[PDB]
């Protein structure tokens, strides 16, 4: 396999299904990612995260850098040997979780972890590079939700600066260069003349794949979708479109109606332990009394291994007992339900049928 | 398969080698019993217990009666449905967990939920029953350690006056009596006669099995040992003997070496969630900061899953994080410690050199 390659094998209006081929395997596009907090996705081991259908998963370089440590990991032989996932990995670039969880400047950020700590262009692609990361996220700037114009033009400006900067270290890097993909991030806020400027920007240093930031902070979705209309269709047609932090099923739905070809979200993962889990009937929280004596699958159509041998009485008493079982089978048959709902998105666009199913997907799912 | 079959098929000084037969499937002995609290062996699914070898588990009456319910258990077909374990499983009587967890009399004892509730031999045979335990644990009264012989005596012969009340329940119920087993518990604390008397009454009652109860509670290993110098020679020597409560590793080699055919303990499930992990040369504490960069298994010679994937490194970040991928692998490592003991014992046994093996079973693992 190469070290990149994305083709579309099929459209429906902006929609798109193909695959991205890299040196560690094929992903399926539209393509949903598990996300792999602290080099584990959550109760789930590796060859499980498989059996439902992923072809990637996330790597939070945040998480990471702190614990256990970028440069241990490397000594330990990179992610893929450390965790068992042998398959890519797309790993972000450590920017987000500073703002929200942990002193900013042109040169990049200081925090304490929640230790001092460091990013910038060049500590984040570094980083990535000693995690071993397949998908390497360019280094940017926050734009907190909602942004003046002002503001998030001079910090879309400075996020371009900091995205050829990420070219410039990847690059340098001859290992990473010849083994990795970088992609660029899209900002800009809601403003469509600084969505367009970004994409020229990006576009011109060039990237593997482009993500549009900024998005699923609070302007929800309608707002979203607005931006979406505009912002995707500036963006290269022939590279991935990764939609960063969107994961609601309906979200995706309407996502890739809108041109976008990858997603993450901790949801599955995070609502799932919390006792949500999803159905093509819309969500329900399996903690509620209504399921104690429910000899149904959580889900009267899913395939997963959870909905072939356990009820949701059995769940809803493990969840209520706090259970590791039980996070580890609600977790399991959310990013299953994941998976079936990207492998159905899939389908019905290869067979010029994805209005139709989005169209039915909500009639039920909202019904 | 018969309702119930033990047969010896190999011996060396006490220690025996074995089968029992039931209709759920076939238990070799000497065998450890993992522990299922409430419904689950913590952080494992029922297919990955078998994986390790186990061919038995036991359910907790106590737990199971609180959450989620005897009756309501009953109602969704019965533990073995209800949790995805189609082979046998043990119940215990619900008093020990009353006495330690949770109004005491000769009908039994009244409680409040750590709700009130209530257990007698009756309710107890009861509760097994709608469970649908392939083994019966006959309802007694605790003997603290340490008991004057006065009060031992006097609670050893309420106890043998109950495990009557527990075979008659028993076999009042067609269903339970033609498919499970009943097993009496031996008690009398440290004296040899009272001991004795147990026995003799329990016997003349008449068990599918005997357990010795009372000891793990504070005697320390050399008292053990010498109460089940004396204590299991009484108990009839066709039938399984069990030792409640006792799993360290040395604990059980030198109980084999004394007669005891069965075990349980939660030592491996528990202490594998908070970070000691069993090994041939002793037990170790991976978070200590000197597994940080140890690319090695968690054991040299473990043959199982989590020894041919993952190092000693991972685990330790995972156990130190607190995620639950960590209890997974931990647990699962440990139960099938415990179980490549008990094949080591069989094997030893069978081919008459178990003296042979506990002797460099000690040397080592206390090296
Ligand atoms: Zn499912
Ligand atoms: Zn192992």
Redesign the pocket.
Known sequence: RPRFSFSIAAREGKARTGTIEMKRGVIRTPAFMPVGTAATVKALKPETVRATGADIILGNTYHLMLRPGAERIAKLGGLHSFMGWDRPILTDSGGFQVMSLSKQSEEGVTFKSHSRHMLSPERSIEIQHLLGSDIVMAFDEVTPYPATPSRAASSMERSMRWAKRSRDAFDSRKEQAENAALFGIQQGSVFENLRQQSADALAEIGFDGYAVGGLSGGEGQDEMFRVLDFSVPMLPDDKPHYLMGVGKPDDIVGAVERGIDMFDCVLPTRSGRNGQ?FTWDGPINIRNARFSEDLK???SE???????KWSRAYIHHLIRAGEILGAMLMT???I??YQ?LMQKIRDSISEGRFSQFAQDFRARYFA
């Open positions: 889990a699958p959580l889900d899913c395939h997963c291994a959870v909905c072939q399991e048959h959310n299953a339900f079936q």
